[PDB]
Amino acid sequence: MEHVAFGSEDIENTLAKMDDGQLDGLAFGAIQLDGDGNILQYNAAEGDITGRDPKQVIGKNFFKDVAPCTDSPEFYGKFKEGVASGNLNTMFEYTFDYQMTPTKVKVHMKKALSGDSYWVFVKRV
Ligand SMILES: *C(=O)/C=C/c1ccc(O)cc1
Numbered sequence: 001m002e003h004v005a006f007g008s009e010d011i012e013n014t015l016a017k018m019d020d021g022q023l024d025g026l027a028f029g030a031i032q033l034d035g036d037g038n039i040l041q042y043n044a045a046e047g048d049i050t051g052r053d054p055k056q057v058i059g060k061n062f063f064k065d066v067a068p069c070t071d072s073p074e075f076y077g078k079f080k081e082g083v084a085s086g087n088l089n090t091m092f093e094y095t096f097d098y099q100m101t102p103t104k105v106k107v108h109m110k111k112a113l114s115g116d117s118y119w120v121f122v123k124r125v
């Protein structure tokens with residue numbers, strides 16, 4: 001395992017050192033998005049939660065293509081305000097229900113330490 005707790009205050013500094021292989025050792029799902037919502041990184045734990053194959057969703061748009069259930073003011077709306085503002089740090093519960101059994105999760109969205117990238121972290125509840 002990589003030992004990093006979900007919700008940790010300095011998580012963006014810790015994850016700045018990991019490559020795709022290290023990200024697969026986290027105890028929670030991790031997605032890195034660009035400012036348009038395209039998927040740059042997608043770890044093994046996220047694929048275990050949602051059924052998606054990580055290598056197949058990299059490059060797709062999360063809000064348009066992969067996760068239309070998140071295209072709502074409650075999820076995408078928060079993301080886009082964060083990108084526009086250049087700051088984002090929010091945690092909320094959500095249900096993922098597209099082409100899968102409805103699954104309740106906790107989501108943490110946080111701006112990355114690098115400029116135009118954003119993390120989405122997911123764990124079951
Ligand atoms: C709603 O459409 C949610 C879909 C979804 C969430 C998270 C993922 O990693 C993949 C699909």
